[model samples]
Target: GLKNPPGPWGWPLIGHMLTLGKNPHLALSRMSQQYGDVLQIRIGSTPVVVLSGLDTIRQALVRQGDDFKGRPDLYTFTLISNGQSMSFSPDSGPVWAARRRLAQNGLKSFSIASDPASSTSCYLEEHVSKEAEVLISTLQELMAGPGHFNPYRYVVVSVTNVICAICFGRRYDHNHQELLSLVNLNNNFGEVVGSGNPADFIPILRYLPNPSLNAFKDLNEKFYSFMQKMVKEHYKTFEKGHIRDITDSLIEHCQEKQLDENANVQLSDEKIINIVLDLFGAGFDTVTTAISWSLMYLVMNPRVQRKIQEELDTVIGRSRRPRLSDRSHLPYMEAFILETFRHSSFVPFTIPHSTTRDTSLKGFYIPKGRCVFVNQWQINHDQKLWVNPSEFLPERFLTPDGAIDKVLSEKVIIFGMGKRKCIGETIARWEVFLFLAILLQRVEFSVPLGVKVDMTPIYGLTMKHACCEHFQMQLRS
Candidate 1:
């Protein structure tokens, strides 16, 4: 008989799956406290080893990289993504490399530096500006109108527009039926995943008459249909010359590969569509969710909010909106953005990674094919790693020399580590800083009387606020 790591004993058959399914972060946190940093929690018949704390995660993810390269294919992800997306798929073979290469070329540091005047950057900037303008205009109208305004739709529209510009080379109006439908479908999908559906972990529950399954099917159709339309539109306009967008670049690569015998590589329209889908799907919701959470946090923590505003006033002034160039000059604001990443734990646990080969970490045997999770929330909020872990402390990131602490700043794994880190980290950081700075400069956040903003995250594909209500704030001159 083999002795596994100690953890809370669970009922036979169900295991600890129910406890995790109820509230994974909280349950895991409690388990970490009781069972030490690394523990095993059996979900149904499957054994999952939860790696909490910086030391454990660092040892497993950083030290033993190649050994932990596989990924678990959940039924929902498999059906929706069709295993083409890099984020969800297993980490092996040529397909993963090709997809990873395409993403890196389009999104990583080398690509950004090579094309300093890259069209992708221009597209993102313009997309954000246009959406911001619409939001301001809408808010102005809502101020004059009778009914109260909801900024959620405006924010969602803005983020999706950025994704559209990246993927399709154009941004759609908020009223565009296709764009609106896509947003709705994605939000619905997110809602279901966040609602703690038991079917995700327990494979047997999926076969029953679950409403989430139907919702997933509908959302998948809408998502796939939207991608197909974008691909067809790309084909119609390909002869117009190099447009310098992701879809155009992908199509160009596909064409070039077909022409070269030496390359011996070809990608079908489905592959291209899947790639485009992956870009849009990953970019839109995660960026918007982070921005939304930032706004909510600012509303809740007005003192910190005021400090941010003061910095913006002193640095950029009220006359001009924040730009990417302003980031280095505003160190406190940058620290605040990092704090947001730590506080929110956006994608809470990293997208799960599995063991490709048998590996040992700190004398524990990690068998091949075991699902391994990088518990980001635990690492980010670890008492040993952070001075005041539970509190919303942005100042901890600030150094005595008035510069931000580099080590503390870099410690965040909001984006995963090593080879599979987020490709769009640069763009995402730029967008968050610019948007939050500008928004904070012009607005003062506050919760409406009697209405509380829910800080507790509703777990799913990504972490998001439990209550999706619009927060109230007065516009500052």
Candidate 2:
């Protein structure tokens, strides 16, 4: 047996469920302060270790990367994904490799490619800029009367459509019913996973009626069913000469993949379905949430918003568009966004990792099945690392020369690290910068009358504002 990290105990069977209270990340962060960074605690019945400080975490994620690459055996993931989705699977072997390769290829055009000649920035930039243009128009359309409406719906549309275009090679109308339904389903699914299931922690619930399980299954089926329809439609229009989007690229691969002795192709239909779902689900939420948090913070702190606009005016000017290349020119804007990532810390903890074999982390005995968590919440605000960890100061990311500090930039872990790092990192950053720049250049946001601004982040699968989803916006002069 390994030396378990120390923590508080709870009820007979529930263990730390009641002990940790509502917010696990904050609770654990509080615990780590007293017990040390690499604290171990039993969650329900499982022996879990939390790597808090930068050194211990980097050691596990970067140095001994492969040893901690596998995901935990979550009942919700297995039940919801049916071992189909790449992220849902516990195994990090052949299936994962094949799917990852195909997904990378599928999303190649949207990301920063290694080969400059092969880079798809042209396609991606055009799509993103065009969407930003429509986002401006759409916000204008919504705020015509100005009685105060939720921009969350509009923001979701703007962000989700980019992924939609990439995923299916088609975008929906602003008020498309199917698109609305899909967004709703995705949110419901996030809530289910975010809240977690009782059955997962307590096995006896498996023998009883579990509505959360059914809710998970229903949403999962709906997602796959929608993906299947899109795949079938793409299959109908599949062409050898034209590789338009992810669907076309995947269909092309699945068709051309050679079958081995056991008749296994490079990519299967089911694999592609889950793979695309993984990308779509993962990419859509994280970027949208981060962008939302950014806008929320800008408006919440009015001076920050004006300073960003001032930088925009000085750097890009009013008549032109903001590109990824221009990101270097605007120091304050980059600092603000970087600060948002650090300040809000979208994900409190990186996706949990399970040990594949009996591996020792930093000389501490980590058993084969111990669950591992990287305390991003604590690390991002590590008192030693950041000067004022709680303050919303973007200047911290900049140096005396007004240039963005590359050293400080490396600390933001909104995306996880190592082999399982969020594959959509490049595109997410690009999309956020482009969308936010355009919005700030043309639009202004404000608090409605009698509306109290709450900066408190609602904890779930990701950190997001329970407030300001309905903040007022208008065309800026």
Candidate 3:
């Protein structure tokens, strides 16, 4: 038998539900400070264990990878995904393997390739520049006219268009009704998740007609309906041998049964939908939130923005838009983007994980089927790991020779680690680099007079800024 991990106590039945509801990240961070890294608590009947320090997370995710392969099946997830989606589904033998395989194949075919220079290079470059132009146009329209502008919506469209192009084989018009509805559904889903519904912990509450339950169901219907349309359209086009996009790849894989038998023995239509949903959901929300934060950080830190512009002027010049290949030349901009990931603390918690089998760490036992939450906020903000973690300083990632520090790049765990890490990381990096480079090259960002920007995040399924005011930038030509 192993000793139980140390943690703060919670009230009977409810556990830390109320405390987490008030402020999830802050509550968990405080507990880590008191308990010293690993903390255990009960959210109702659920045995929740939180891995706080960077060492503990690395040990579990990297060193003891197999032991922590399970994912908790929270009630909210069951309601929204019905154990179908890959990202939130529980760790099962066949389902887990199949989902991983599907994702790996889809991402490899669409985003990552061995020969990067000749493969899909122009596609990414062209797509990113086109989206950047739209973003610039939208911003100019807002600033020139009297109508109110939602920078949040602008960021959402830009990010979603990238994912939409990759997944569905088409990008939605900026003001399309279907596109707006999809964005709303995504936002609604985020809100419901952030609210910390009690039904997840208290299973019995799930039976009752609750407000969160209603909202969850409504959002699920909207999302499922949208995905169904995408699936239908994809299959229709793919059956005709028009292999233009990722949707076509998925359909072809489904028809050909291309998944490795050793890795993925079972694959289904639902599995395909779920995999596409995973890419779209993960791609749209996380990237949009990150890019928004990067923009905010740039607006707040003018010097850093100017440095990025200077790099663009020198390396990319005004003759043409920046390309993904130019990422190496624009080291400062890359560092700055990385610093945003570190500083923003988006997805502050590591999206709840579980164990395949019973595992022990530092004399503590994490039983099989137990929920393990990695407090990425604590790790990203850890004083010991980062020098001046609170400051939004990009120079920390640069070497003395003014190049990006390779060692530091490996340490940034925002995209996660191991087999379960983000599969679209390569494309995401390209998108961010190209998008930021293009934006800065053509425009300058600043807040209106006498208005102070809010750095505080709005707690939801995803971490977003408290106000879009932070993103309200004056266009510079």
Candidate 4:
């Protein structure tokens, strides 16, 4: 018989819930230092298997991905997309894969597809540049009036606009109350859904009174209702062979599939439409978090910021905006974004995973239905993997000739690993590159004199640093 992985003994009932403290990723990484890479720790009565170190995680999530690809059936997940979320639902089988494929295709067609009508290379570039221009102008307007501003407030709206343009063929103003309410609800979503939330593991908590839990359910209802309305509008205007946006494309997939007698996997119109819920929901926060952290890194590291600006100046002059094509030419910017991902480790961990069947990893037994947490932060910050892991160095991702080290950059795992990796990985990276490039080209970010910059991340599904309240933006011409 295979042995259970090694871990610290837990107290009765509560288990290691008390041990994780405010930051579960940091706590789990520290635990891995004591117990080795593959270890089992209990959360409440549920046993969770934590995989640390890149090699061990690769062996499990990549090599044996099928066995460990399933999402854990947590209580909060039941509320997401009303239990039909492709990203959260415990259904990682064929039907889920079909939905994922449909989403991938829809995203690709609407985002990456070349538009002969547009002057920009693709729809993604057009949308990003449009919002990036708005973000620049908004920052300029805010700087002139307020003196100090919150980057998150304007940035979130700008980022949401890009996703809205892609999903709905529309955009929103910065102060659009309804849109503001929807995007602002993201932080609350992260607080409850993040890995290691006690309410998820402890069943009794669900039956008890909890403010965060109630707020979480309420927000999901609000988000679902918003998406449901958008989808309903799409249904009315949807035409055959005339796909308008991702929503229309999805509606077409549903209609086309219904006619196919031999369609292997069946998905209802609701399930298909809700794919936009996953896209619209997941799309904004991850990219927003990445771009926000990149801004912080730029403010903190003047020399690196200068280098990126210099690269932008030489490759893309001020006369034109940065495009996806410019990404290859701007190697320094690419390296900087890669470093931001590794250093911040904003996502920290993939949405919690579960074992699909009884599986043994590294000679240790993991029973079916066991919740699994892959410590991506640990892998990125592993002393053995990175030199001076605590340091934020973009040049480390660059080769001797100053081009991006593709192999080294691939190791930074923000989008996640294996079959369950984020589908928006490519577009998210592109969004980060374009948004940061445009911002850096437009303005220089700095902390106001006498104001200190705090890099400490607030741990959640996606980590966010304290909002920069004293920001000084100097426009560059």
lDDT for every model?
A: 0.72, 0.76, 0.75, 0.88
List the candidate 1 regions with Cα displacement exceeding 4 Å: 1-4, 108-123, 185-188, 191-197, 262-269, 467-470
Q: Which ten residues in a row have the lowest lDDT in candidate 1?
A: 107-116
Q: Which pairs of residues have clashing backbones in candidate 3?
A: 70-354
- 330-378 in candidate 3: lDDT tens per residue? 8899899889988877767766778888889878977888888777777
How much lDDT does candidate 4 score? 0.88
Instruction: Itemize residue pairs with steric clashes in candidate 2.
Output: 5-40
Report the C-alpha lDDT of model 1 over 349-427, residue by residue, as the tens digit.
7667788788777667778888766677877877778888877888988888768888889887788775566777888
Q: Count backbone clashes in candidate 1.
A: 1
Give the better candidate number (1 or 2) by lDDT. 2
TM-score of each: 0.90, 0.92, 0.91, 0.97
* Error at 392, model 4, angstroms: 1.4
Best by TM-score: 4
**Per-prediction RMSD in angstroms?**
3.1, 2.8, 3.1, 1.6
**lDDT rank, highest first?**
4, 2, 3, 1
lDDT of candidate 1? Answer: 0.72
Which residue pairs show collisions in model 4? none
Rate residue 367 of model 3 by lDDT.
Answer: 83
lDDT of 3 at 155: 76
